Design an enzyme around this catalytic site. Sequence first.
Site, PDB file in Angstrom:
ATOM      1  N   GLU A 136       0.826  -1.209   0.000  1.00 22.47           N
ATOM      2  CA  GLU A 136       0.000   0.000   0.000  1.00 22.47           C
ATOM      3  C   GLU A 136       0.855   1.253   0.000  1.00 22.47           C
ATOM      4  O   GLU A 136       0.673   2.133   0.855  1.00 22.47           O
ATOM      5  CB  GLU A 136      -0.934   0.002   1.207  1.00 22.47           C
ATOM      6  CG  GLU A 136      -1.727  -1.269   1.368  1.00 22.47           C
ATOM      7  CD  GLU A 136      -2.806  -1.148   2.411  1.00 22.47           C
ATOM      8  OE1 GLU A 136      -2.774  -0.179   3.214  1.00 22.47           O
ATOM      9  OE2 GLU A 136      -3.700  -2.006   2.395  1.00 22.47           O
ATOM     10  N   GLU A 235      -5.038  -9.629   2.022  1.00 17.83           N
ATOM     11  CA  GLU A 235      -5.769  -9.556   3.282  1.00 17.83           C
ATOM     12  C   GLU A 235      -7.249  -9.635   2.957  1.00 17.83           C
ATOM     13  O   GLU A 235      -7.684  -9.139   1.906  1.00 17.83           O
ATOM     14  CB  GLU A 235      -5.507  -8.209   4.003  1.00 17.83           C
ATOM     15  CG  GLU A 235      -4.088  -7.996   4.519  1.00 17.83           C
ATOM     16  CD  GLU A 235      -3.803  -6.566   4.987  1.00 17.83           C
ATOM     17  OE1 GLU A 235      -4.749  -5.739   5.074  1.00 17.83           O
ATOM     18  OE2 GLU A 235      -2.618  -6.284   5.296  1.00 17.83           O
TER      19      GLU A 235
HETATM   20  O1  LIG Z   1       5.781   1.777   2.184  1.00 12.24           O
HETATM   21  C1  LIG Z   1       4.573   2.455   2.558  1.00 12.24           C
HETATM   22  C2  LIG Z   1       4.654   2.619   4.070  1.00 12.24           C
HETATM   23  O2  LIG Z   1       5.149   1.445   4.767  1.00 12.24           O
HETATM   24  C3  LIG Z   1       5.115   1.613   6.197  1.00 12.24           C
HETATM   25  O3  LIG Z   1       5.524   0.398   6.862  1.00 12.24           O
HETATM   26  C4  LIG Z   1       4.666  -0.724   6.574  1.00 12.24           C
HETATM   27  C5  LIG Z   1       3.763  -0.994   7.767  1.00 12.24           C
HETATM   28  O4  LIG Z   1       2.851   0.089   7.935  1.00 12.24           O
HETATM   29  C6  LIG Z   1       2.959  -2.271   7.504  1.00 12.24           C
HETATM   30  O5  LIG Z   1       2.173  -2.553   8.657  1.00 12.24           O
HETATM   31  C7  LIG Z   1       1.226  -3.612   8.511  1.00 12.24           C
HETATM   32  C8  LIG Z   1      -0.173  -3.018   8.316  1.00 12.24           C
HETATM   33  O6  LIG Z   1      -0.254  -2.361   7.064  1.00 12.24           O
HETATM   34  C9  LIG Z   1      -1.225  -4.130   8.344  1.00 12.24           C
HETATM   35  N1  LIG Z   1      -2.615  -3.675   8.596  1.00 12.24           N
HETATM   36  C10 LIG Z   1      -3.754  -4.225   8.162  1.00 12.24           C
HETATM   37  C11 LIG Z   1      -4.708  -3.476   8.702  1.00 12.24           C
HETATM   38  C12 LIG Z   1      -6.240  -3.623   8.551  1.00 12.24           C
HETATM   39  C13 LIG Z   1      -6.644  -2.461   7.666  1.00 12.24           C
HETATM   40  C14 LIG Z   1      -8.156  -2.507   7.476  1.00 12.24           C
HETATM   41  N2  LIG Z   1      -8.565  -1.558   6.396  1.00 12.24           N
HETATM   42  C15 LIG Z   1      -7.591  -0.838   5.614  1.00 12.24           C
HETATM   43  C16 LIG Z   1      -7.973   0.042   4.608  1.00 12.24           C
HETATM   44  C17 LIG Z   1      -9.321   0.233   4.347  1.00 12.24           C
HETATM   45  C18 LIG Z   1     -10.275  -0.461   5.088  1.00 12.24           C
HETATM   46  C19 LIG Z   1     -11.620  -0.232   4.784  1.00 12.24           C
HETATM   47  C20 LIG Z   1     -12.623  -0.889   5.489  1.00 12.24           C
HETATM   48  C21 LIG Z   1     -12.275  -1.777   6.503  1.00 12.24           C
HETATM   49  C22 LIG Z   1     -10.929  -2.009   6.816  1.00 12.24           C
HETATM   50  C23 LIG Z   1      -9.895  -1.356   6.116  1.00 12.24           C
HETATM   51  N3  LIG Z   1      -4.119  -2.529   9.424  1.00 12.24           N
HETATM   52  N4  LIG Z   1      -2.911  -2.679   9.353  1.00 12.24           N
HETATM   53  O7  LIG Z   1      -1.059  -4.919   9.506  1.00 12.24           O
HETATM   54  C24 LIG Z   1       0.211  -5.534   9.666  1.00 12.24           C
HETATM   55  C25 LIG Z   1      -0.038  -6.428  10.871  1.00 12.24           C
HETATM   56  O8  LIG Z   1       0.832  -6.052  11.930  1.00 12.24           O
HETATM   57  C26 LIG Z   1       1.272  -4.443   9.789  1.00 12.24           C
HETATM   58  O9  LIG Z   1       2.600  -4.993   9.949  1.00 12.24           O
HETATM   59  O10 LIG Z   1       3.862  -3.344   7.296  1.00 12.24           O
HETATM   60  C27 LIG Z   1       4.664  -3.188   6.109  1.00 12.24           C
HETATM   61  C28 LIG Z   1       5.418  -4.507   6.013  1.00 12.24           C
HETATM   62  O11 LIG Z   1       6.529  -4.490   6.924  1.00 12.24           O
HETATM   63  C29 LIG Z   1       5.547  -1.932   6.257  1.00 12.24           C
HETATM   64  O12 LIG Z   1       6.225  -1.681   5.032  1.00 12.24           O
HETATM   65  C30 LIG Z   1       6.104   2.705   6.585  1.00 12.24           C
HETATM   66  O13 LIG Z   1       6.101   2.902   7.992  1.00 12.24           O
HETATM   67  C31 LIG Z   1       5.746   4.021   5.907  1.00 12.24           C
HETATM   68  O14 LIG Z   1       6.810   4.960   6.171  1.00 12.24           O
HETATM   69  C32 LIG Z   1       5.593   3.828   4.396  1.00 12.24           C
HETATM   70  O15 LIG Z   1       5.051   5.045   3.820  1.00 12.24           O
END
Ligand SMILES: OC[C@H]1O[C@@H](O[C@@H]2[C@@H](O)[C@H](O[C@@H]3[C@@H](O)[C@H](n4cc(CCC[n+]5cccc6ccccc65)nn4)O[C@H](CO)[C@H]3O)O[C@H](CO)[C@H]2O)[C@H](O)[C@@H](O)[C@@H]1O
Length: 430
Positions: A136, A235
């Site tokens: 993302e 996911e």
């Molecule tokens: O590269 C883009 C960005 O990456 C960020 O780090 C990422 C982290 O933010 C990311 O984190 C991970 C995270 O994205 C993921 N996660 C999944 C969810 C559920 C989202 C639900 N959701 C989302 C969107 C719309 C929705 C609409 C309706 C209902 C639900 C919706 N929330 N978090 O859960 C993992 C578990 O722990 C994390 O590890 O993990 C990646 C893999 O290591 C990392 O690259 C960086 O911190 C950031 O600097 C950078 O801009």
Amino acid sequence: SFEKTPAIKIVGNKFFDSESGEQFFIKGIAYQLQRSTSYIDALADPKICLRDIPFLKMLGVNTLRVYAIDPTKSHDICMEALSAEGMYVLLDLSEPDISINRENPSWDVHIFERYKSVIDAMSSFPNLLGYFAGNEVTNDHTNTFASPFVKAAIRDAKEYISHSNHRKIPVGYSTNDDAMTRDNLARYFVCGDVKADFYGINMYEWCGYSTYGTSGYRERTKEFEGYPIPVFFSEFGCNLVRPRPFTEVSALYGNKMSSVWSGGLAYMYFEEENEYGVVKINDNDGVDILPDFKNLKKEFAKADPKGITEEEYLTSVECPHIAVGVWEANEKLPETPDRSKCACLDEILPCEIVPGKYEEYFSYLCSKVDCSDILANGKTGEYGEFSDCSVEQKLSLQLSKLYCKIGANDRHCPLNDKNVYFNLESLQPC
Ligand SMILES: OC[C@H]1O[C@@H](O[C@@H]2[C@@H](O)[C@H](O[C@@H]3[C@@H](O)[C@H](n4cc(CCC[n+]5cccc6ccccc65)nn4)O[C@H](CO)[C@H]3O)O[C@H](CO)[C@H]2O)[C@H](O)[C@@H](O)[C@@H]1O
């Protein structure tokens, strides 16, 4: 032994078991602990992974998505334990502190070294299904210019794997589900000369007791018919209605969807107060099953995707156009980050900086010298010659340019800060 997990390979837009030739469908769950290293690596800790694997077996998963591993630690014990239950791993290469920053994108030696470290740590395992080069990164119409950096990362990870002695583990991408950007993102990652090997969508459109037609799954499936690489839900598991019935699983592995999608992974194993878990770890470190668990178990158990075989299956795409405020990912990609070249800056530069201050000092230094050589613009496809070096190397270059333009030659670097130093190796006559 990795007997129970033959390596999975890709042919066209499907995954296949490399021994049997049977199509492989992902029935997965996200498996990642987080604090409340910065990340926690459950696959480096046998007492954690060996606790949970019996519960993962009960669920009936064949794949985990893991978002972050520590490449300095061994993973043999957990990967072999997973293999022994027929379980594979999809693994992100990034970690929260070393990822392509969607707010200020770069593809540089520091991020690439992270990616390489993970590849070197994990590629010996036959049950390593694939790597994600990003998650993302672009997530709406305001940061589409991050995507060329991700495509460069895909290219360079694949090339590094190709040149290594390792099995050629595929490298793909995981995207969100933003209406304005999703079609353009899907096309971009298969366009031109560099392609993702597979494409995961973080898909939350099905909530509660929805249907194939009303959820949006029918239209998603139609837009992905004939997409040239394997596509799956990286996911799923909208939690608007609880306990989650997971009735989407019946649609996903049914006949309308099983010819397009390669399955998916539920989000997620651990309950961490986003209310997405199927188990909860108590204060004694024991596993407490939550009411979602049995519904996921029942649905995966019932799921019976009718695939094809490799032999019967066996019988460039245009990049989206640029439009201001809508789609701004240039087809032209940044160069492969060059560790040797950037390491030369550490050897030869007169003024160096050891790793708020970056902003202040780039703003200060870039008013005095021309910083074009470290700028990277994914909209215009203009990437400076040293734009692939680390943030400190880039800053050091500009400091050193200012030092040479002053021309005092007195070992006084023109920035008063404790992290600044004169580099004595610069005196030894890249
Ligand atoms: O590269 C883009 C960005 O990456 C960020 O780090 C990422 C982290 O933010 C990311 O984190 C991970 C995270 O994205 C993921 N996660 C999944 C969810 C559920 C989202 C639900 N959701 C989302 C969107 C719309 C929705 C609409 C309706 C209902 C639900 C919706 N929330 N978090 O859960 C993992 C578990 O722990 C994390 O590890 O993990 C990646 C893999 O290591 C990392 O690259 C960086 O911190 C950031 O600097 C950078 O801009």
